[PDB]
């Protein structure tokens, strides 16, 4: 039988089939089959042809996005795609009338637009070109200017800027529409005073000088960008007509000192919900703004003010939880810390302090799904005490007691992490079932919870897997320090335990990091364990989430300790078992993972001959204002500059040689920028230790163009052959 | 015994002793002992403390350098060395006035001064500040501002900008004063339409953000600095006094078009050489223009005019050779080729355009050294029909067939390869003998020919070298395509013509290259064939020097074609000898060298098993416009784009698929920009070709830092060991 081979990972010979839907009501949703927008009926079974795919090959481009109008009178075609950060682009977009099955050729959206959003309801679009926001009531009118602040690398009207992009929203949008459309709220960036991240960007071969690509970037404790948050009525919008907008300012509490805004949420057309939390990110606030019809202001009460602290580390995960607020928005319910240090659901009312748990117990839940006026739906790693497991539960409101898990016993073997997506009154759901087996997608009825039909079971690629010695992934824990930690482990075929196998192991370990978990993978580690006879081990030690705050804040203020001494402590112990050749331990990893193999690799411990960092952090100092100071505190003396200082890979360039140092880096890298592992390779040249090297010229943070992807995976193997002696 | 190891190289454990001199008159020297300045008598031997060592120490800086002014009333002192590009520095300057024995603590020279110097008669100062000409007539007296129109990166009086400095100068200086020190002439320099290269430069750990160095820098084919020329009147020099100047523009057939100023000769104090060049390089001409006593002028005369054409390539070597004139100026000798090829010495005279050979022959004169009256002092490699060999020959000036060689049969078996520096009036000399022996460093009289004293035998080196397994320098000839071309080796000790031993080849092969001579090396490829049991072969095919215009413009607008072919077809006779394992191949080299290695490497011949590049051109229209359009012509369809386009190493990326490829590069490199590896690496990412890399963080092109040095050989050592199977 043959194996899984490198280039049946890097040509994806063996496609994972997803099956990705877009809910427009309570009962239907759209689906692009075969290039076909299909209008899915979750109700009766039945589907419709909602857009053919002979429109899309006339359109005269390629079709990667598509956004129907609330009303379903109107279709958004994105085109002439141009990517700029994780999340950001600029593109190209047509509107097509499905009423009179034409294409909007007169006031037309234009070229280079940011972003784009349809009202919830009817259709309006919102967009953002040239760091300006612009209304367009009707698709063939003319569109309304809202913001004329706008200004490249400088104001941002309705956009983020890279550090809200990357670290605080996750998304390029800062857009929030009024659940009817009255209401257009928007933040303001302004980077007049961060400093710029300048590199050279090569571009194409003809290109005879490079180009310097400058970018608003604030690194730990230099000076951060700042948001202005308003919210414009939408309804005097006319030609002739000034722009009538609110600002609503955050709490006195926020307001003293550097803050961010870090999440918005409509309750009514007249209750905007905002999440504000200060630079330090141990103190976060709800203020719950009312509209006033007489003034137009959005006024802000003491008794609607609810403020998250944390003493033991930060607040929330990488940012607060989300409110997620009843109909009426007189109450609310979010996933806040307990008493105990476990992440759980507490209902707060919109005017008053005190909030009650309704989830409790040594486990934490993930995310709230939906919200009804009878249940709340949420997933959780409370099954079987696995924290690398999700499963989909309903709590009755009017009594917690009664709390129902319907994923859990599903495809029990199979089925052990799970993602769910309602409908509009959460009448209907459909559940992603992402492993340990084969991914499985899913329809069911919220009434019943009764599965209505297998949208997507992956069966060519169970035939496919059948003709290959697939390797084995095991789950299991370990005890540090008294505390049992998880950890995997990706076996070869007709894996001996007599035999004693090479060990690679795979690390993330950054705050509220998860590398052990039940998701089934056609990863590189596949090839690894399947053609190599390598064992790819991960574990979650101290700083890992989804296990409580004793855990997770364990770090807090000392990244690159624990987190690094506990990757060691597990490898001992895995190399104790006698299956593995201590004499062949490597570690690899990216990111935060490539800081912590370097700190692994300059830790001295002599349990790795050899390790792979790949675009790693290697001075906290060089990284993001936001990432690095929830996790860190200030670099100044007063604060943390002293676990700062120790904390940077250079400081352990010595130990390097002891070991085979693999150290991988993208030249046009915006995120980690290539600084980093520049002065990473300075300190080990200027500590007289050999090391390899690879740069990825005009390559980002991902190495994810097909080329790129294809030779850093191709060097690494020829590495981890050589390394462990293997043909 | 003990072998030449890597750490003996390094470290530089075996040193190599050289004498420095500066001859201050016709029979008197100066010489840095201790740190002591001695002033050594040629003509009677005796020597004297010129400055005591106990001044240095009392100073409160370290004097890397010293200038004593031609009158030994003053000396100036250099500190605070800070290094820029190839041959420009910034410093600061102290004056030690020799006849009261005190400082100048008044009027001193300013905190970064670009350069100075003194005038050649007397103890008048004109130094560069701020991109201006400052002169000072008396050391404690203030300085005259000559020139107000400096600007940083833009416009340049009194030095070289990036590529006047690099390709046409080789010095930061651009100022020449007068025989007498009436006149300052200056070259200014005007950068304002040359395009910039921009790259990141780290700086220290502790520097949060990278900063942009941004230099003004013409690729081939675009904006080239403009240069004026004027001529100072010194003796008007007056606080509220004009400065009295005159621009001397180049003659009509070279002023209609881009040319470059590549030389300037006082001749007398009413007389200046100015030789220019059109930017096609292939057109020179020498115009001689006198001072105008009555309005300050300086006339020029077609009668005075001396024109140099090349049909077959490029006029000069690297540059038209400079012209060498008698006292009265009425006549010059020059070395230009002749009707056979070969570069000779030329009598012309002052107001006639013809010339008379002086010296003629299958081989070529070097330089010339010193002109008298009587005799004509020249290098040439004339002597037992070597080119890669150097001599010291007089030629009697009223008969040319009295040619006497002053150095030949002095030591011949120690001393083939020579350098002389003569007194004031040539009536002593020293002379340099850099091998194939130990460089052996001598005194001789100009009258008698008499060695008067051995300077240095490097007896201390011979006793060293005792004990060490050193390896042998075989020099020979090979035919290639009915030419004979000359090679090297450095054999291991022992050698066993049984044994296959590894073989390394040593290449530049760029136009005018000679890797092929007798000169003494402790390097790299010493170690090699030493401790690792390498040969190391370096071979000067088509397109290299001292051979005649024949072979060297041979690759005339065809760089990567003869010399590239020649290098592959050298290897192939290399490894037919009984002595060479074929298997184990390898080839390297920096700069034009690398480029060549990447030619060799993807020729696709099977030749080679590996190579390395270091700092290589990958692409010409990314080199800069002197050196590139000189051998290249203009990159555009009109002229030699074709040839630009086909002699890319990208061009060649599919075929690196067969060899082991490491390339090097630092990334703050201001003549071959990162940019080359940068975009060489992406075309063998695109074309699916694994290789190695290794960045140097804020290196330059030498990658000479003590630590990045020893990193670099280190590195290569371990890639050529992996790569010929070696311990
Ligand atoms: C356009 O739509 C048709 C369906 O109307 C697509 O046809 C299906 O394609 C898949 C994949 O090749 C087949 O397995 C089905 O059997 C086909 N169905 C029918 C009814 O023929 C067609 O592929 C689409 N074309 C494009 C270019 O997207
Ligand atoms: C930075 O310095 C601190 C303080 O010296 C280090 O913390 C100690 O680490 C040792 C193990 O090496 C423990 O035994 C101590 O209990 C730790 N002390 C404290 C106060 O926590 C820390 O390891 C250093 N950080 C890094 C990244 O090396
Ligand atoms: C350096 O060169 C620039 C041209 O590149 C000269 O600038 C021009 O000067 C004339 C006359 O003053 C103006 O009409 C042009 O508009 C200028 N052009 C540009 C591009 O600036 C400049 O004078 C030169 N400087 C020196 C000191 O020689
Ligand atoms: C660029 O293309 C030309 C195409 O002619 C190459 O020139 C030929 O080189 C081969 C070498 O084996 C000779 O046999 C031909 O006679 C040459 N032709 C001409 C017209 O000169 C040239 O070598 C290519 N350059 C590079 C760098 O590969
Ligand atoms: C809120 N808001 C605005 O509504 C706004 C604005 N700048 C403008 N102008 C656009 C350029 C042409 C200029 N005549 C008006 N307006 C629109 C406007 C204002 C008042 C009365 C009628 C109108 Br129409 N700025 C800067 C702003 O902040
Ligand atoms: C390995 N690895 C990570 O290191 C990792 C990660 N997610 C995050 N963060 C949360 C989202 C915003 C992101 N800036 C931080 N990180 C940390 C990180 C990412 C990129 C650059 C530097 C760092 Br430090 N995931 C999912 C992962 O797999
Ligand atoms: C040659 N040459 C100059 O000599 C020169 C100059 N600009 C100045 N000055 C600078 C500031 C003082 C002001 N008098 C003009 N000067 C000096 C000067 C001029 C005329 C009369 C006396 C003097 Br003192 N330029 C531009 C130039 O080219
Ligand atoms: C290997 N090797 C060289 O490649 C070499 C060289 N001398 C020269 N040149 C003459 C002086 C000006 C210089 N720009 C060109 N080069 C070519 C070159 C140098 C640096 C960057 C790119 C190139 Br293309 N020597 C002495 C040597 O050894
Ligand atoms: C499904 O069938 C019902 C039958 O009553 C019909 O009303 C509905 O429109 C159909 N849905 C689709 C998507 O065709
Ligand atoms: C952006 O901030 C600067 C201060 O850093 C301020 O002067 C400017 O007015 C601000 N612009 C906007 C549109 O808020
Ligand atoms: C708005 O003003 C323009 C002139 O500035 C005018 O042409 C247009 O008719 C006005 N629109 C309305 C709705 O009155
Ligand atoms: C939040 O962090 C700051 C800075 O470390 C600290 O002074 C403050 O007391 C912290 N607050 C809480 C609630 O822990
Ligand atoms: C200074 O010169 C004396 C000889 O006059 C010598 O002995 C001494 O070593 C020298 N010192 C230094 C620091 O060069
Ligand atoms: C060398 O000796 C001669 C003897 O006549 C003397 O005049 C001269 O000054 C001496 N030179 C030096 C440099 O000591
Ligand atoms: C030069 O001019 C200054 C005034 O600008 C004056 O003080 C000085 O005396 C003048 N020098 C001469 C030589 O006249
Ligand atoms: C000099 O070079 C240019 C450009 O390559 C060319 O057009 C011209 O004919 C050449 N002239 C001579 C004399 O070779």
């Known amino acids: 039988?043959?194996?899984?081979?490198?280039?049946?990972?890097?040509?994806?010979?063996?496609?994972?089939?997803?099956?990705?839907?877009?809910?427009?009501?309570?009962?239907e949703?759209?689906?692009?089959?075969?290039?076909?927008?299909?209008?899915?009926?979750?109700?009766?079974?039945?589907?419709?042809?909602?857009?053919?795919?002979?429109?899309?090959?006339?359109?005269?481009?390629?079709?990667?996005?598509?956004?129907?109008?609330?009303?379903?009178?109107?279709?958004?075609?994105?085109?002439?795609?141009?990517?700029?950060?994780?999340?950001?682009?600029?593109?190209?977009?047509?509107?097509?009338?499905?009423?009179?099955?034409?294409?909007?050729?007169?006031?037309?959206?234009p070229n280079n637009t940011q972003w784009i959003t349809w009202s919830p309801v009817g259709h309006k679009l919102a967009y953002v070109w040239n760091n300006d926001i612009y209304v367009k009531?009707?698709?063939?009118?003319?569109?309304?200017?809202?913001?004329?602040?706008?200004?490249?690398?400088?104001?941002?009207?309705?956009?983020?800027?890279?550090?809200?992009?990357?670290?605080?929203?996750?998304?390029?949008?800062?857009?929030?529409?009024?659940?009817?459309?009255?209401?257009?709220?928007?933040?303001?960036?302004?980077?007049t005073e961060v400093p710029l991240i300048e590199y050279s960007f090569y571009s194409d071969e003809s290109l005879q000088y490079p180009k310097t690509v400058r970018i608003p970037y604030p690194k730990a404790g230099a000076e951060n960008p700042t948001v202005k948050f308003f919210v414009?009525?939408?309804?005097?919008?006319?030609?002739?007509?000034?722009?009538?907008?609110?600002?609503?300012?955050?709490?006195?509490?926020?307001?003293?000192?550097?803050?961010?805004?870090?999440?918005?949420?409509?309750?009514?057309?007249?209750?905007?919900?905002?999440?504000?939390?200060?630079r330090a990110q141990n103190y976060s606030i709800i203020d719950i703004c009312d509209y006033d019809e007489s003034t137009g202001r959005w006024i802000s009460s003491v008794a609607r003010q609810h403020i998250e602290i944390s003493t033991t580390g930060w607040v929330?995960?990488?940012?607060?939880?989300?409110?997620?607020?009843?109909?009426?928005?007189?109450?609310?319910?979010?996933?806040?810390?307990?008493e105990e240090?476990?992440?759980?659901?507490?209902?707060?009312?919109?005017?008053?302090?005190?909030?009650?748990?309704?989830?409790?117990?040594?486990?934490?839940?993930?995310?709230?799904?939906?919200?009804?006026?009878?249940?709340?739906?949420?997933?959780?790693?409370?099954?079987?005490?696995?924290?690398?497991?999700?499963?989909?539960?309903?709590?009755?409101?009017?009594?917690?007691?009664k709390v129902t898990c319907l994923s859990c016993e599903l495809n029990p073997e199979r089925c052990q992490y799970y993602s769910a997506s309602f409908s509009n009154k959460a009448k209907y759901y459909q559940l992603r079932c992402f492993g340990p087996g084969l991914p499985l997608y899913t329809l069911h009825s919220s009434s019943s919870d009764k599965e209505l039909r297998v949208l997507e079971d992956n069966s060519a690629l169970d035939k496919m897997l059948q003709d290959v010695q697939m390797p084995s992934k095991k789950?299991?824990?370990?005890?540090?320090?008294?505390?049992?930690?998880?950890?995997?482990?990706?076996?070869?075929?007709?894996?001996?335990?007599?035999?004693?196998?090479?060990?690679?192991?795979?690390?993330?370990?950054?705050?509220?990091?998860?590398?052990?978990?039940?998701?089934?993978?056609?990863?590189?580690?596949?090839?690894?364990?399947?053609?190599?006879?390598?064992?790819?081990?991960?574990?979650?030690?101290?700083?890992?989430?989804?296990?409580?705050?004793?855990?997770?804040?364990?770090?807090?203020?000392?990244?690159?300790?624990?987190?690094?001494?506990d990757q060691i402590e597990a490898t001992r112990q895995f190399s104790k078992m006698g299956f593995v050749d201590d004499k062949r331990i490597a570690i690899w990893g990216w990111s935060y993972g490539?800081?912590?193999?370097?700190?692994?690799?300059?830790?001295?411990?002599?349990?790795?001959?050899?390790?792979?960092?790949?675009?790693?952090?290697?001075?906290?100092?060089?990284?993001?204002?936001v990432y690095t100071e929830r996790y860190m505190g200030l670099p100044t003396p007063e604060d943390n500059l002293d676990y700062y200082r120790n904390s940077t890979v250079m400081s352990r360039a010595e130990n390097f040689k002891q070991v085979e140092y693999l150290l991988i880096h993208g030249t046009a890298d915006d995120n980690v920028h290539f600084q980093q592992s520049a002065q990473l390779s300075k300190a080990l040249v200027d500590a007289g230790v050999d090391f390899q090297t690879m740069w990825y010229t005009d390559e980002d943070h991902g190495i994810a163009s097909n080329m790129a992807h294809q030779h850093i995976y191709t060097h690494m193997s020829h590495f981890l052959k050589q390394c462990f002696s293997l043909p």
């Open 1 to 27: 039988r043959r194996t899984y081979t490198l280039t049946d990972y890097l040509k994806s010979t063996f496609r994972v089939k997803f099956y990705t839907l877009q809910w427009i009501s309570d009962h």
């Open 29 to 109: 949703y759209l689906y692009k089959q075969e290039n076909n927008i299909l209008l899915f009926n979750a109700e009766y079974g039945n589907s419709s042809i909602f857009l053919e795919n002979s429109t899309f090959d006339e359109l005269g481009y390629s079709t990667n996005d598509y956004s129907v109008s609330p009303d379903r009178q109107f279709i958004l075609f994105e085109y002439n795609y141009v990517k700029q950060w994780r999340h950001s682009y600029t593109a190209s977009y047509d509107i097509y009338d499905l009423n009179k099955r034409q294409l909007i050729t007169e006031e037309r959206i």
């Open 137 to 191: 009531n009707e698709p063939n009118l003319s569109s309304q200017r809202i913001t004329w602040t706008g200004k490249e690398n400088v104001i941002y009207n309705g956009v983020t800027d890279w550090v809200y992009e990357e670290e605080v929203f996750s998304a390029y949008s800062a857009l929030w529409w009024s659940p009817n459309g009255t209401f257009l709220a928007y933040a303001q960036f302004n980077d």
């Open 232 to 278: 414009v009525d939408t309804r005097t919008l006319s030609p002739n007509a000034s722009v009538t907008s609110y600002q609503i300012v955050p709490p006195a509490s926020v307001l003293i000192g550097d803050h961010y805004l870090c999440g918005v949420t409509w309750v009514t057309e007249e209750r905007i919900s905002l999440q504000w939390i200060r």
């Open 316 to 338: 929330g995960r990488f940012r607060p939880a989300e409110p997620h607020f009843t109909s009426d928005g007189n109450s609310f319910y979010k996933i806040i810390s307990n």
């Open 341 to 401: 240090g476990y992440k759980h659901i507490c209902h707060f009312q919109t005017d008053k302090s005190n909030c009650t748990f309704i989830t409790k117990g040594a486990w934490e839940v993930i995310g709230i799904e939906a919200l009804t006026s009878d249940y709340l739906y949420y997933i959780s790693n409370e099954h079987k005490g696995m924290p690398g497991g999700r499963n989909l539960y309903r709590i009755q409101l009017n009594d917690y007691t």
């Open 475 to 565: 789950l299991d824990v370990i005890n540090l320090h008294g505390t049992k930690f998880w950890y995997q482990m990706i076996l070869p075929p007709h894996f001996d335990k007599s035999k004693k196998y090479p060990l690679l192991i795979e690390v993330y370990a950054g705050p509220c990091s998860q590398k052990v978990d039940t998701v089934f993978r056609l990863s590189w580690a596949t090839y690894l364990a399947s053609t190599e006879n390598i064992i790819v081990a991960s574990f979650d030690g101290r700083g890992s989430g989804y296990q409580g705050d004793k855990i997770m804040h364990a770090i807090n203020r000392r990244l690159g300790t624990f987190e690094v001494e």
């Open 594 to 625: 490539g800081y912590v193999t370097s700190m692994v690799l300059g830790a001295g411990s002599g349990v790795f001959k050899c390790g792979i960092a790949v675009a790693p952090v290697s001075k906290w100092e060089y990284y993001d204002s």
